[PDB]
A paper describes a structure:
The coat proteins (CPs) of single-stranded RNA bacteriophages (ssRNA phages) directly assemble around the genomic RNA (gRNA) to form a near-icosahedral capsid with a single maturation protein (Mat) that binds the gRNA and interacts with the retractile pilus during infection of the host. The canonical ssRNA phage Qβ has a genomic RNA (gRNA) of 4217 nucleotides, from the 5′ to the 3′ end, encoding the maturation protein (Mat); the major coat protein (CP); the minor capsid protein A1, which is a read-through extension caused by a leaky stop codon for the major CP; and the β-subunit of the RNA-dependent RNA replicase (Rep). Like many other viruses, the CPs of ssRNA phages can also assemble into virus-like particles (VLPs), which are not infectious. Through a native infection without engineering the amino acid sequences, we found that Qβ CP can form diverse VLP capsids, including the T = 3 icosahedral, T = 4 icosahedral, prolate, oblate, and a small prolate form elongated along the 3-fold axis.
Besides the 5-fold non-icosahedral capsids, Qβ can also form a small prolate VLP elongated along the 3-fold axis, which is a new conformation of the virus capsid. In the elongated face, different from the 5-fold capsids having the same triangulation number, the 3-fold small prolate consists of two different triangulation numbers, Q1 = 2 and Q2 = 3. Moreover, the triangulation number of the two caps in the small prolate is T = 1, which means that Qβ has the potential to form a T = 1 icosahedral VLP. However, we did not find the T = 1 capsids in this study. The elongated faces of the small prolate consist of two triangulation numbers, Q1 = 2 and Q2 = 3. For the oblate and small prolate VLPs, there are two types of hexamers in each form. The “over arched” type, which provides more curvature with a θ angle of ~130°, includes hexamers from the oblate and small prolate VLPs. When produced from an infection event, and purified via size-exclusion chromatography, the population of the oblate and the small prolate forms are around 21% and 3%, respectively. When over-expressing the gene containing only the cp and read-through (referred to as A1) fraction of the Qβ genome from a plasmid, the percentage of the oblate and small prolate forms increase further to 35% and 12%, respectively. Two forms of these VLPs, namely, the oblate and the D3 symmetrical small-prolate forms, have not been observed before.
Numbering used by the authors:
A (entry chain P), B (entry chain G), C (entry chain T), D (entry chain J), E (entry chain Q), F (entry chain H): 1 to 132
């Protein structure tokens, strides 16, 4: 799963904009991989972090944590540094039994990708529409 | 958010399998959508929960969670009553503040679909890979 | 009483403004339709709640309820994300006998629209004068 | 808002009927003033009664309460009390704060008239149809 | 089982078509899906509604409840407001197994449809005869 | 309501099976039909019973109830005495006034058969799809 630049295009309500997710690296103390390198000033900018586990004797499974961060910087009208006042984002945790089938794992992946394109979740997220 | 036409396509390594969910109602006391058209029996295995998109004064901030179960059950040796042995489960929280806009919420939802489509999450899930 | 956009023509003291009440859905634990215009997580959000129901046979009658909310606040000067501090609203409950026809129920609905547009209710706002 | 006769045209199921509500006054210890059919008996049958604040001792608030009743009087089997019939009232409240503007209040009054004319309330009231 | 108008007939002893249940929608708090005849007055119509299930994992029994109401009303000796003097009724609940099933329920649904034509019920129900 | 073996055709999803319910006497109360299937195991597992309306008395001692019970066994290889692992069931209650013609009684049984054959209940019961 080489941490190569990921470009996610055709995103937003109408599928019109893009995000560059250019890798900062993988953390040596915890296995966490993260995508940044936007050229933009830190903590105001959009970031994507994906961490993984090993099929450890203490878990019997493999996990993937996918967290997307797209905070808004605001900026007080005065002083110095800008700062985030608004959070607007999501965190997907996956669990795959170490003895699971790869296709089962592959289904879970795309099932979410497909739900994210489903009118029910589109309305629940973009319009904040109550299900029914 | 009307419950209708929810089919998840491009499921699996080949991008060819589908799962039909077309939710047909929500939990009457919680506002929780129940997604599965797997079959009279398979609907007890292949399941998606999407909730709670219903707004409130005691929520302020907006949150939706999606719970995806894609289990395989094994038939008893020489008997009735098959049961699940393997998952292949995902659970995502979408969390936006009280003042968030639709474009940012949408950005993330479509960003996740694009991210799932991206090779980084294909090898992370199918080969269980750290990002190298 | 479908979850279709309701466009309200000419409103306000001089009959000049209009609303587009983009439907969101029915809040399932409450059973009430909800329309709102921007789709932002609400504070300063126009909101319309509508329902028709059949109470249990302790009440033995039919009801329709409508609530129209008009929140407002001043600018969060020097910062971001202003809250709602003031709200005006309509709240109408229509209580009907189960043996009544649609036409009389309609008279109650239509007479109110005709009366709301009449000089007495115009003065009970414009001047804020008491009724005699 | 001293009462005056109000002619409510374009009313009922087809939006084509006319009903005239003539004033009935009392010093409004009971804040509700009355507009009703000329009578003598119909005056006590089809009526709208209206209370306009005059905020209470709690310094709350500007409001208007309109109560609309349109019974079907019926003469049958030799009786002498046709005026005793089917209920009830549409209880209408225009709810405001203390220093709401006249424009804010007017929107509530005219938005409601505009919504009463909308298919959403037409079907909820005449056919008693649910939002689905 | 999307609600749609249901036409029923050859129900009475004359073999004639009778019954059409038109308005549709589901009360989401109650889990009750309508169909009915009240073109104007609800209190005089015929109704068939179904309780629409979604069992917990501690039951898995998707009970379907078919509620049948067939009231008869009179004016006859009066000028207005017909009201119910007699009512025929049925209430049928269908159980489901803990692992679900398929054909076995089809047998129960169709067994009952066939059973209702059995000479034992024709007299046990039409003449109220004890079986004997 | 003479006791005779009841033979019902049109059973199952394709309408091709036949179920035969042989009398087992009437003593829960006189006339409560007890009809069971053929063979030692079906004699334990599959049956239909029918309740009995009484001579006047307070109208509590009424309501024909048809109970369709279809438990089914599973066996070990070479096992003697099969036992139930699944049960399908229909709890069918009828209610009439003591004055309800003869026609209404017939009407409700056939209306129910007409509903059971309807796509609305085919999907609610065989496909487990809520009627939304």
């Amino acid at each position: 799963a080489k941490l190569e630049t990921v470009t996610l295009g055709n995103i937003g309500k109408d599928g019109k904009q893009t995000l560059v997710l250019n890798p900062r690296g993988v953390n040596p103390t915890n296995g966490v991989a993260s995508l940044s390198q936007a050229g933009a000033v830190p903590a105001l900018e959009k970031r994507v972090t994906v961490s993984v586990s090993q099929p450890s004797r203490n878990r019997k499974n493999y996990k993937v944590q996918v967290k997307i961060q797209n905070p808004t910087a605001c900026t007080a009208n005065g002083s110095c540094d800008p700062s985030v006042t608004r959070q607007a984002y999501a965190d997907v945790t996956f669990s795959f039994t170490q003895y699971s089938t790869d296709e089962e794992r592959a289904f879970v992946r795309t099932e979410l990708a497909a739900l994210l394109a489903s009118p029910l979740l589109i309305d629940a997220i973009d319009q904040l529409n109550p299900a029914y």
